[PDB]
Design a protein around this ligand. Structure first.
Ligand SMILES: [Zn+2]
Ligand SMILES: [Zn+2]
Lengths: 196, 119, 56, 154, 215, 56, 196
RNA sequence: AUCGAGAGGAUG
DNA sequence: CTACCGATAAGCAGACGATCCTCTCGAT
DNA sequence: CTGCTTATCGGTAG
């Protein structure tokens, strides 16, 4: 019920089987490169290692899971603090140094809107999005170790049918908002005149 | 493997050799804390892995209707009630052995006549 | 199909039609033979556009 | 086959196992690192005499960190292989810069032990991992690269 | 490793053999007695006082058959050398050229064991009129023309070639073509212009003859 | 023929049973894998042939 | 998260079967993954079907809809034929959907259930028959019920078909691609297309 | 007449 | 024991995608 | 489910 904001997120796993060190990163909307996960969590509200791993892995018994994550941590010892956890997420412009306190407030709301716009899109929610981002990771790995199958794409329960109703909807909505801004553009041309 | 974390700060611990008395110390690159080691085991790879085979087993499994029901007996209790399934570990070169779940008691056993098992 | 248990690699489960065209297929059988025959029409539909580009 | 032979299967089997590619990787249960300090007395109880007969006191160092290798009693039957032939192709790879021990096929547990050696930035540890990496995907045991499953068809 | 000292020698022996077959096939003079030299008599005669195979002890010149002059008054003087040294820089290149330069040969074959440095390949063709060639032991353990799918090729002469070009009224371009680096075309050693003739067999008409110009 | 129709269903029944044993075997880890292919690959190949030979 | 979905599930399924929770909305309990997904999205496709339940007292495991239900169902479809002078009229389809006898099942929820095929021949008792004398030689060979812990049961298999396809006589005696042809031609035959 | 879309026929 | 050359392994991009036929509909 | 361009790797020469 918030139009059609198709904001698509991907969590990738770099390097193939038996490679040097397999590092985990993610694609975020309105951002140039990919970003190590450990930076993302710190940029949310979770700071310390081992607390990070509690959002991701759920059973502190099964190690291989854990031994998978050494590469990521060892990639984030360069950012340990709340504040500049978002300094790395500030490559939007070519040295927007004019925004040292504004790039943060550019990043701060990017994790309000562009990052998982469902779940919620308000202010006071960070542990809501962490447990999830940290559940995508439990899946992405629960597969790379080959403990569960890949996801099937032609499964009929994982697809919907855009009927006459919602067809009209995504049309009428677009129409109405066109007419709505035909009013504004007419109002700026009254007072101006009286008018009536 | 089982590696460990520091108190106070709460991060990961990275190994170190004691030059003098020859022993093993972990520590965080944040505060300074340093604890002694337990087992000499620092790293482990495993290419052929016996775990992952039997996941998702609960105390609420003898209810799922989509699982098949056989005429085995538990070598401990003796109830001909049980449910079963192949290796949940979806690899290509895996084996076709069954894993049964004693319902009157709660036990776990296999159909593999050869190959020793420790669960 | 949801008319079967899990982990069942027997003939009937995995698409062997016991019955002949005369005796008549059964419900599951019907549906399997369906998935099959379909592959025919699929190929001739979209594979020919290659077998005909080759010729050119 | 060579015209000199024809229906001698035993000949073909040889050629099969002189051609087929086999990496150290395909015969490894698990690789692992340990802190073993006392060279003569190991901290592990599974390796009492290895380590008990080696007979190194015929000459007669050192290295701190150790790297163990469990092997699968399984693929020592199909692919034709002996512990020795393994060990040799290992040392032959690096040359005179790492000690290497092992047990006999007769034993119940097949194992390898290795230790870096011996120059003269500490951080000695990370790299040791990139040896056990090179050790798996890059070590030939017998046969020609690019070749896989080789079939005995008549 | 005492078997890897025993195979290394055996492979060197078939490579030796294959070099012989090629030299005579260019048009030079070798007995079938010299080629079919058993593994015995080679175990000694070419090693040292222990069993280590001396390469410098194999090198030999080569003279054409009295029949080859009738078709090629040019072909006359060939020399082959083997080498102990694995890596061969610009320093080893200086030695061999100077050998021929004064001996006044025309063809220089050099069989190495591992590979040649690009600092050595730079100073190869820059010393005419004569020409030098090169081959990897590992690519000469087996003779390639001694294989089914390969038919026999026959270098034909200059005054000869003009005959093909008149009696099919062709232009140089119009012939089919063979590659300089081509396995066979090296096995004989072609040139910019030299034309082959190929006597392949056929299910249509017993024998069919194709001609290829070189590139 | 009635005598034949019977004989056909009985020539499917000893070939649906020859499959139950090749499963019954593979499931107690006695089924040796053919050189160069998976244990599951030699079961699959096995059964599929058991059912084709059954029809012809 | 929730602890003990033993009862939490059963309470959800009880209220939908009464009609309290909209019969559209679907509910997927996952034992072997420890998950519970509830879906309310628009576009899910679903279908019938009947319900089965061992909740029966002196009569093992059986279907819910009894012969008595069937009667009140035809005492409706005949009632509005001859004497339709307002003689207390009721008992439609939606009456079933509320008395809890039919459940709208979508594809995702189709993963957790064990559907039967033939109501009668799929839970009567043993004999058995298979190779046991005697039967009709000329009739077809059916799988046989071998698993018995059913939950649902299909309405009638012919219902897998479409509008054009259900025109075909004995489609289960035809080679499959043929029934697809007739489907395309049935739409190009000729007759009465509307009475007006 | 021109540009644009969709449905159908023949190889199944 | 450092810059200049050169030669190769590594990684983004392209221009193709059956023949013929019948009809209907909306558009600057 | 590619020929061509861009990038980082070793070789011998200032
Ligand atoms: Zn600390
Ligand atoms: Zn028990």
């Amino acid at each position: 019920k918030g139009s059609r904001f198709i904001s698509t997120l991907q969590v990738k796993l770099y390097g193939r089987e038996g490679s040097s060190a397999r590092t985990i990163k993610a694609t975020l909307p309105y951002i140039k490169q990919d970003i190590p996960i450990v930076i993302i969590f710190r940029a949310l509200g979770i700071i310390p290692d081992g607390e990070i791993l509690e959002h991701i892995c759920y059973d502190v018994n099964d190690w291989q899971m854990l031994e998978m994550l050494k590469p990521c941590v060892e990639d984030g010892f360069v950012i340990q603090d709340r504040e500049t956890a978002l300094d790395f997420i500030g490559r939007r412009g070519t040295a927007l140094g004019i925004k040292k306190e504004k790039r943060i407030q550019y990043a701060k709301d990017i994790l309000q809107k562009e990052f998982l716009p469902h779940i919620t899109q308000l202010e006071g929610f960070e542990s809501r999005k962490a447990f999830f981002l940290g559940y995508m990771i439990n899946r992405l790995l629960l597969c790379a170790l080959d403990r569960k199958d890949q996801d099937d794409r032609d499964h009929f329960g994982k697809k919907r049918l855009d009927l006459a109703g919602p067809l009209l909807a995504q049309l009428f909505k677009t129409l109405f908002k066109k007419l709505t801004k035909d009013i504004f553009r007419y109002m700026q041309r009254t007072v101006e005149e009286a008018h009536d | 493997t089982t590696f460990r974390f520091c108190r106070d700060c709460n991060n990961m611990l990275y190994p170190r050799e004691d030059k003098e008395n020859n022993r093993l110390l972990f520590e965080c690159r944040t505060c300074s804390y340093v604890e002694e080691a337990g087992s000499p085991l620092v790293y482990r790879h495993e290419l052929i892995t016996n775990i992952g085979e039997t996941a998702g087993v609960v105390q609420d499994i003898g209810s799922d209707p989509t699982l098949p029901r056989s005429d085995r007996e538990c070598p401990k209790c003796h109830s001909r009630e049980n449910v079963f399934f192949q290796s949940q570990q979806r690899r290509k070169d895996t084996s076709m052995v069954l894993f049964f779940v004693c319902l009157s008691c709660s036990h776990i056993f296999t159909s593999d006549q050869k190959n020793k098992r420790t669960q | 199909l949801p008319h079967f248990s899990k982990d069942d690699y027997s003939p009937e489960s995995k698409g062997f039609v016991e019955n002949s065209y005369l005796r008549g297929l059964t419900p599951q059988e019907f549906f399997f033979h369906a998935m099959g025959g379909r592959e025919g029409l699929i190929d001739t539909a979209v594979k020919t556009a290659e077998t005909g580009y080759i010729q050119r | 086959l060579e015209p000199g032979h024809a229906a001698d299967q035993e000949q073909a089997k040889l050629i099969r196992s002189a051609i087929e590619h086999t990496t150290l990787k395909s015969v490894t249960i698990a690789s692992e690192i340990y802190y073993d300090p006392d060279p003569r007395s190991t901290v592990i109880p599974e390796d009492e005499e290895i380590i008990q007969l080696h007979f190194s006191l015929l000459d007669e160092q050192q290295s701190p960190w150790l790297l163990r290798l469990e092997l699968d009693r399984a693929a020592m039957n199909d692919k034709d292989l002996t512990m020795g032939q393994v060990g040799e192709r290992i040392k032959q790879t690096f040359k005179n810069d790492l000690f290497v021990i092992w047990s006999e096929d007769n034993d119940e547990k097949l194992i390898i032990r290795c230790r870096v050696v011996r120059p003269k930035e500490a951080e000695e540890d990370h790299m040791l991992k990139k040896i056990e990496n090179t050790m798996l995907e890059n070590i030939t045991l017998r046969g020609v690269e690019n070749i896989e499953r080789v079939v005995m068809m008549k | 490793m005492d078997q890897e000292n025993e195979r290394n020698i055996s492979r060197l022996w078939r490579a030796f053999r294959t070099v012989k077959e090629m030299v005579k096939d260019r048009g030079y003079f070798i007995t079938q007695e010299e080629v079919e030299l058993p593994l015995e008599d080679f175990k000694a005669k070419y090693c040292d006082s222990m069993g280590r195979p001396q390469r410098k002890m194999m090198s030999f010149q080569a003279n054409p058959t009295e029949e080859s002059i009738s078709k090629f008054p040019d072909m006359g003087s060939l020399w082959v050398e083997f080498c102990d040294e694995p890596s061969v820089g610009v320093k080893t290149m200086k030695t061999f050229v100077i050998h021929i330069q004064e001996k006044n040969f025309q063809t220089g074959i050099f069989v190495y064991q591992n590979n040649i440095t690009p600092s050595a390949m730079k100073l190869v063709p820059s010393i005419p009129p004569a020409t030098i060639e090169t081959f990897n032991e590992a690519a000469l353990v087996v003779n390639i023309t001694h294989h089914e799918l390969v038919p026999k090729h026959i270098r034909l002469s200059s005054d000869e070639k003009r005959e093909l070009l008149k009696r099919y009224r062709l232009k140089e371009s119009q012939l089919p073509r063979i590659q300089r680096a081509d396995p066979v075309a090296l096995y004989l050693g072609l040139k910019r212009g030299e034309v082959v003739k190929i006597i392949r067999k056929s299910e249509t008409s017993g024998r069919y003859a194709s001609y290829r110009i070189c590139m | 023929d009635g005598p034949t129709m019977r004989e056909i269903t009985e020539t499917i029944a000893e070939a649906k049973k020859k499959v139950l044993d090749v499963t019954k075997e593979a499931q107690a880890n006695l089924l040796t894998a053919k050189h160069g292919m998976t244990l599951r690959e030699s079961f699959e190949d096995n059964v599929v042939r058991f059912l084709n030979e059954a029809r012809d | 998260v929730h602890r003990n979905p033993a009862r939490l599930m059963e309470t959800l399924r009880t209220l939908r079967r009464k009609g309290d929770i909209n019969p559209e909305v679907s509910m997927i309990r996952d034992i072997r993954e420890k998950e519970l997904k509830i879906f309310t999205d628009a576009g899910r496709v679903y279908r019938p079907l009947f319900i089965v339940e061992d909740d029966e007292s002196l009569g093992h495991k059986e279907l819910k809809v009894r012969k008595g239900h069937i009667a009140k169902l035809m005492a409706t479809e005949y009632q509005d034929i001859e004497g339709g002078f307002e003689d207390v009229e009721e008992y439609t389809w939606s009456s079933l959907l509320n008395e809890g006898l039919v459940e709208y099942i979508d594809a995702e929820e189709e993963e957790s259930i064990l559907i039967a095929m033939q109501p009668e021949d799929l839970e009567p008792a043993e004999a058995n028959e298979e190779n046991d004398l005697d039967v009709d030689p000329a009739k077809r060979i059916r799988v046989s019920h071998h698993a018995t812990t059913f939950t649902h049961c299909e309405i009638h298999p012919s219902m897998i078909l479409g509008v054009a396809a259900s025109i075909i006589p004995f489609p289960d005696h035809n080679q499959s691609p043929r029934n697809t042809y007739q489907s395309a031609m049935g739409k190009q035959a000729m007759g009465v297309f509307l009475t007006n």
